Design a protein around this ligand. Structure first.
Ligand SMILES: Nc1ncnc2c1ncn2[C@H]1C[C@H](O)[C@@H](COP(=O)(O)O)O1
Ligand SMILES: Nc1ncnc2c1ncn2[C@H]1C[C@H](O)[C@@H](COP(=O)(O)O)O1
Ligand SMILES: Nc1ncnc2c1ncn2[C@H]1C[C@H](O)[C@@H](COP(=O)(O)O)O1
Lengths: 517, 517, 517
C-alpha cells in the first residue's frame, strides 16, 4: 500500500556482533529476464551423450533466489572475526525481503532499443514452504548473490530433473507446474517478505585439533596392558616363541587404543608440480566413482579425508577437494595456476589421508607351513569406535544442503560442506507475469505466442542470525590466526582493481583456533 | 481503492482436499480485444446454405468468461484422486474474481506497432444474475480457460441467436443490448468479484456397476413363478399344447424380472478398422436425427447408451459419443487417429447398446392359421420400471448446462454430460469501454466511427467447492484404478513437450470404482 | 443370557386389526444345512449354453431368510379382510427375531445315522443394513417362509452374480466374502433381533375403477368443441370439403379428451382352448424381449397391461402375467390345468390390452393425389397426459423389490408387483460356524478339508405393521367381494388335505372394491 512514488523498502547491508550471536544482512540489486518465452519446456540430454550423462527434465519460466554461499552474508573482515575468535557457529533464523520492484518494457526498432516503465505490470513471487517442488539449491550452482554489495546480479532460471531411462522418461517422471502454487502478485509499490527459523543443527567446527588421534596417551607413563612383541626367539637358533611386553613411551604405535580413524574411500593422488604426474588422460578412467543405476558418477569431493600427509604439501587428491576459480578464469580447461584448490589438512588428526589406504588386514590363517599374509584396505565403512571431522566451510561455498527424504541417512552432513537440513530455507520463486500483445479482432482458440518483451529489476535483502560458540581454551602459546600480508602489493586482497572488478585471491577455511581431542 | 501501483489481487491456483469436499481454484491470464469496432451487428446465415443450417442473430462487442470445462478446475492428478477414491461429486458453491487489469492502446505507424499503457481507460464487467440474456454457455464452444495454468487465453466474443424464418427474422426475434444492464466500470486498480451457490443437484455417478440389470437374480435358487416353456408337444406327432416350467439357473433369460433397460434411440454403427465400413458418404444421410420446425438436426451425442456390446471394442456409434481432438489437430477433416473417441462402455449393465435395437414386440394376433410374427423396436420412450445411467463426464467436457425454461422437462440431465441446472452459474460479460479519437471542431450529429484502438489484459480466478461421496464398498478384490503407464516414453502424458505445448493424450472418464445395482 | 435350559423366545403367529393399521406376525421353524462344505465357490454357466443364458458368479456357504411373499404374513382370511374392506395398504415397520437355536451333529456309521446335540456349537447371523452385498431378494425365488404356519422350511443358499463376458469374468467382477462383515455368533440360548422402518411409499391400489378412461364425459350434454365430421361432401357429386360438428352422446369416440392410456409394449396372445393356438414352438422365437448387452431377455411379466378385452376371457398374453403352480405341480413342462394364470383384467379402464396395439398414427402427408395412410403403434413410451395402473399384488407374490441404484428411474414400481423400495428390508444372512475334525498331530499349513458334519434348526418370527386406507365410497349398489363357494366339496379351499398337504387353489388379487377415476 504505497504507490508509484513511495519506496517500498530501505537498503540494509550491515553486520552487527552481539557477542553471543552475529546478525548479518545483505541487500543487493537484481534483474529478472523473461525465460524461454513464458514456456515450460522439457529438456533432455542429446542422444549421443554417454550413458552416464543422460538426463530428463523440465525448464520453467520461473527464476529463483539463492543466497546459499557464505560470502553473500559475510564480508572478508566479518569472516575474519568469526573464524579467529570462535570454535563454532550455526544459523538460527533468517528474514527475506523483496522491495523497490520495477518492470521495464523493451521495444526494438531498427537497430535502436528503447526501455520504458510499465507501471501496471506485475511480478509473481512465492516461497515454497512445504518442499513440494524439487530442491535445486544445494547443488553449488552459480547465480547466488554476488560477493561484493555494489554488484548487480541476474536471477537464475529454475529447472529440474526427474527419472529417465536413457534420454527418455519413465512413467514416474514428475512434472511440476509452478503456476499451480498460490503466489503473491506485486506491482511497483508492493513488497514481499517472509521469516524462517533453522532447525537445531550441530555447530560447525571452527577449530583444528591440538592432538593426533593416536597420540592421546600419556607420554611419560608405561601401560599395564601387554602386547605381542616377538613371535620368534631373539638369539640363538631361530625358534617360534610368543613374547609379550608393555607398550610405553619408546614405542607408541604398539599401544592399545580406544578409537579408530574415520571411514575412508580412497582417492587418486595428483602432483601440482608439472611433469611429476603420469602422462595419460585419466580424470574419468582412473578416478574414484560410485555406480548408481547403471551410471557411473564421480565421488566429488567425497567423504572428508585429509588432503595430504605430513611434509607433502605439493600433492592433492584428485576430485577430493573443493576448487574455486580466480577472477576472470575460463569455465573450460583452466590452468592449475588459475584455480584455487582448497586444503583439508586440518583433519589429519582424525580422518585418513584421502590418497592413502585406510590400513591393513590379514587375509589368511597362518600355520607353521604358511606364513602370514595381509591385505590392504582401500575403503572402509563405519566401525564402532570411529571418530571423524566434517569437511570445512569456506568463505565462498555451500552454507546448507537439503537432507534427501529417505528411510535412512548416515551422518547427514553435506559432503561439499555446511549444515545438513531436513527443512532447509525454502525456495523463493519469481517470474514476470505475461503481458499479451494486441490480440486479433476475431476470436481464435490458439494460444498466444505474442507477448510484450519486458524484464524486471529490484532489491533483495537477506538477514540471517548466526549463533556463536566462544573459545574457552587454556592454551598458553599464541594460536594461528588468519592475517593479511603486510608486504606491499599492486592490489589489495579482497578489493576492487583499477577496472572495478572485485576479486577473492584465496579460499578461506574456518579452522584456525585449536582444541584438544 | 488501490491505484496504479498496487496489485488488486494475488495468484491462487491451488487445490485442497478436505476429504468431505474439495476446493479447486484456477487463476489464469486473459486478453480481451475490441470486437467488431464496438458495434452490435446482426448476423444471419448466407443465402444458399441448406434449410437446416439457416440462422439469425446478433453479434455484440462484449466478451465473456466460461470455465464450464472440467480441466479448468482440476489438474490431471487432482482428477485422478477424485475418480479413483469417490462414488460421486457435485458442485456446491463458486467464487469469481477479476483483478490486475491493464488497458493497452495500440498505434500503427508504417510497418511498426507501438503499445503503451492507457492508465485512465476503463473496462466494463457485469454478471447476469437474473438470466435475462440468452445463455450460450452449455453449447460446448471453445474459449474456456486453458487446461494448463501457464497458458494465456483470448476472451471469446458474445453473440446470440433468436427465431428466424429462412434467413430472415420473424417479429418475435429478440434483440438484447447488453449496454442496457447495470455494469461495473473498472480501471487499473479496480477489481471485480462475486459469489455463487449451486442449487441442489444429484451427485454424478463416479462408479460403474458390478452387476448386469438382468443378472440380479440368485443364481443358485429356482423361481416359484412359471413361464411358458413349450407351445408344442415335445415328442410324437407335433401338436399344439401349452407347457409351463419354473425358470432357474440353467436358463436365466426366461425368468421374470422387475426392471427394464433405459430408453433407446438407435444409432448407426461405425468400424474403426479401415475398409470395414461401407463405401459411400453418409454422415448426414444415414444418420439419426430429430426434425424440429422443418429443420433436421443430428441427435448428438444423444441419449446415454452403451457404445458397444461385449467383445466388440472396434465399433463405435456414429454421432453417439463425445470426440476430442489431440493437440495440433485440424478443425476440418481430421483423421481417425487424430481424434480421441470416448467410450460409454461402463453403462452396458443398464442402458441399451447405442447401435442395437431396444428389443422385439409382437405385431399381430396369432391363430391356428396365422403364425406369430414380431416387430423390431428401434426406438423406445420411457416405460414404467426403466432404469438408466447418465452419460459420463470427462476431464475435458461440459460441467453443466442450463435446463431450458419450459413447461416440462424429462430427466433434465445434459446429454453431453454434467449437471443440469435451472439457475446455472451466471454469465460474466466484459468489454472495453469505447475511447473516441479526436472529434471534429464543428458539431456533427453523426455517430463516431473513429476510435482509439486498444485492448485489455488481466487476471481471472475461479474457486469452486465440490462435494464428494466416499466409497463404502465391501468388495474383496482390487478395483480398477486410473493409472499412468510405467513404460518409458519420449514424452510424459499430460505434460508439455520440448516446444512448450501442453497436451492431453486421452480422455478420462470418471467411472472406475464399482457398485452393485 | 439364558443357557441350555431356557427358551430364548415364544411363538407368536397372530394377526391383530387396529382398524387404522394391521399388525401381522408369522413364526416358523427352519433348518439350515451346511452349504458346499463351508466353501466359497465360483459358479458359471456351462460352455455350450446359449449366449443369452451365460452367467458368472459365486456361491457362498451362507443361507438367508426371505419373507418377501405376502402369504407369509397373511392368512387367507386375513387377506380377505384386507382386500374386501380397504382401498389401499402399505408396510410401515417390521421386526425380526431368531430364537430357540439348536445345532445338531450328525455321524454316519455303516447304514445308520445318528444325530446328537452339539451344545457348544455356534451359528452366525448378520443383517446387511448398508446394502453392501448384492440384493437377491426381489427375484421371486423359492425358499420363502411357507404359507401355512405348521410347515418347516429349509433356508436357501446365498449366491450372487456379477459381470461376465461369455462365461468368463471381466476385471470388474466383484467378489464379496460375507465372512468380512461383523456378524453375531449365537449358541443355544442366544437370540437375534432387529427392527426396520419402511420408507414412505405409495399405497397399493386395492381398488378397481368404476369408469373407463375414455368415458369420463357427461353422457347427457353435448360439447362446445367441434371436431371434423366429414372430409367429403355428403350428397351429390363427391367433392372434397371440410365439415365440423360438436361431439355428443351419440358419438363418444369422437370427443376431445384430456388423458391418454398408459404406455404399451405389446405381447403375443395365447388361447387357453387347445388347438386354437398356432402349431409351432414359439416361446422364445415369437416372444417380446429386450436386448441388453448383446443378450436377449424376455420381458416378463412386463409393463402393466390389461390381459384381455371385453368378452374375451379365454385368451391371455404370452409371458404377460404371473403364473403360479398348484400343489404338486412339476417344475418342468406342467400342463395348463396345473398352473394358475393370474388376470390383470381390472386395469382395462386405463392400461392398454397387453395383446393389442396402443393405437394408430399417420405415416405420411396427404394431398389431392396421395390418400392418407396410417401406421400401427405396437409400443409406446410415456406421453404427457398418460395415466396407468400398476400390476396387482396377490396373496402369493412379491411384496417388495429393491429399486436399483442408478442415475434415473421411471415410475420405479416392480413389474412383478408390490412396493419399489430404495432401502428395502435388509438381507438376513446365516451360516453354521465351521467345526474342525481332529487335526493331525504334526503341523501342516494346508487348509482343513475335514469338518464335523452338522446342521442347525430354530425358530423365526416376522412382525410387520401394515397401514390401511379405508373405503369412503358413496356407491349405492353392492360391491364385489371375495367369497368362498358355498357348494359342497371333497376338500375345503386353503386347507390341508387328508395327507396333510396345504394347498392354495387359486391366486387372489387385491382389487375388488371400486373407485371412480
Ligand atoms: N550436519 C548435520 N545435520 C544434522 N544432523 C547431523 C549432522 N551431523 C551429524 N548429525 C547427527 C549425527 C550426530 O551424532 C548427531 C548430533 O546431534 P546433536 O545436535 O549434536 O545432539 O546428529
Ligand atoms: N441432472 C439433473 N439435474 C436436476 N434434476 C435431475 C437431474 N437428473 C435427474 N433429475 C431429477 C429426476 C430424478 O428422479 C430426481 C432426483 O433428485 P434427488 O436430488 O436425487 O432427490 O431429480
Ligand atoms: N412403487 C413406487 N415406489 C416409489 N416411488 C414410486 C412408486 N410408484 C411411483 N412412485 C413415484 C412416482 C409417483 O408420481 C410418486 C408418488 O409419490 P407420493 O408418495 O404418492 O407422493 O412416486
Amino acid at each position: 500500500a504505497d504507490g508509484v512514488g513511495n519506496s517500498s523498502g530501505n537498503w540494509h547491508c550491515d553486520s552487527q556482533w552481539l557477542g553471543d550471536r552475529v546478525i548479518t544482512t545483505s541487500t543487493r540489486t537484481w534483474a529478472l529476464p523473461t525465460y524461454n518465452n513464458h514456456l515450460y519446456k522439457q529438456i533432455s540430454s542429446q542422444s549421443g551423450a554417454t550413458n552416464d550423462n543422460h538426463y530428463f527434465g523440465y525448464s520453467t519460466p520461473w527464476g529463483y533466489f539463492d543466497f546459499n554461499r557464505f560470502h553473500c552474508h559475510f564480508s572478508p573482515r566479518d569472516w575474519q572475526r568469526l573464524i579467529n575468535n570462535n570454535w563454532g557457529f550455526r544459523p538460527k533464523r533468517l528474514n527475506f525481503k523483496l522491495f523497490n520492484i520495477q518492470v521495464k518494457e523493451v521495444t526494438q526498432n531498427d537497430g535502436t532499443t528503447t526501455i520504458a516503465n510499465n507501471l501496471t505490470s506485475t511480478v509473481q513471487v512465492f516461497t515454497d514452504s512445504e518442499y513440494q517442488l524439487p530442491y535445486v539449491l544445494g547443488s553449488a550452482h552459480q547465480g547466488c548473490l554476488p560477493p561484493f554489495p555494489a554488484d548487480v546480479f541476474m536471477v537464475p532460471q529454475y529447472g529440474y530433473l526427474t527419472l529417465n531411462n536413457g534420454s527418455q522418461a519413465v512413467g514416474r517422471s514428475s512434472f511440476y507446474c509452478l503456476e499451480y502454487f498460490p503466489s503473491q502478485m506485486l506491482r511497483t509499490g508492493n513488497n514481499f517478505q517472509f521469516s524462517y527459523t533453522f532447525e537445531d543443527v550441530p555447530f560447525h567446527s571452527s577449530y583444528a585439533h591440538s592432538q593426533s588421534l593416536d597420540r592421546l596417551m600419556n607420554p611419560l607413563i608405561d601401560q599395564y596392558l601387554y602386547y605381542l612383541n616377538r613371535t620368534q626367539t631373539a638369539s640363538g637358533t631361530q625358534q617360534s616363541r610368543l613374547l609379550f611386553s608393555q607398550a610405553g613411551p619408546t614405542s607408541m604405535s604398539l599401544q592399545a587404543k580406544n578409537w579408530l580413524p574415520g571411514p575412508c574411500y580412497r582417492q587418486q593422488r595428483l602432483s601440482k608440480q608439472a611433469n611429476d604426474n603420469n602422462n595419460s588422460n585419466f580424470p574419468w578412467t582412473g578416478a574414484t566413482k560410485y555406480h548408481l543405476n547403471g551410471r557411473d558418477s564421480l565421488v566429488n569431493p567425497g567423504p572428508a579425508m585429509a588432503s595430504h600427509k605430513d611434509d607433502k604439501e605439493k600433492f592433492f587428491p584428485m576430485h577430493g577437494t573443493l576448487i574455486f576459480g580466480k577472477e576472470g578464469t575460463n569455465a573450460n580447461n583452466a590452468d592449475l595456476e588459475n584455480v584455487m584448490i582448497t586444503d583439508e589438512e586440518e583433519i589429519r588428526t582424525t580422518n585418513p589421508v584421502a590418497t592413502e589406504q585406510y590400513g591393513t588386514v590379514s587375509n589368511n590363517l597362518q600355520n607353521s607351513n604358511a606364513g602370514p599374509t595381509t591385505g590392504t584396505v582401500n575403503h572402509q565403512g563405519a566401525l564402532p569406535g570411529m571418530v571423524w571431522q566434517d569437511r570445512d566451510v569456506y568463505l565462498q561455498g555451500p552454507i546448507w544442503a537439503k537432507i534427501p527424504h529417505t528411510d535412512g541417512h548416515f551422518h547427514p552432513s553435506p559432503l561439499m560442506g555446511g549444515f545438513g537440513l531436513k527443512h532447509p530455507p525454502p525456495q523463493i520463486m519469481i517470474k514476470n507475469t505475461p503481458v499479451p500483445a494486441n490480440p486479433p479482432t476475431n476470436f481464435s482458440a490458439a494460444k498466444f505466442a505474442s507477448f510484450i518483451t519486458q524484464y524486471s529489476t529490484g532489491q533483495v535483502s537477506v538477514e540471517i542470525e548466526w549463533e556463536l560458540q566462544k573459545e574457552n581454551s587454556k592454551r598458553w602459546n599464541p594460536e594461528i590466526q588468519y592475517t593479511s600480508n603486510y608486504n606491499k602489493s599492486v592490489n589489495v586482497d579482497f578489493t576492487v582493481d583499477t577496472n572495478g572488478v572485485y576479486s577473492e585471491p584465496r579460499p578461506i577455511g574456518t579452522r584456525y583456533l585449536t582444541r584438544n581431542l
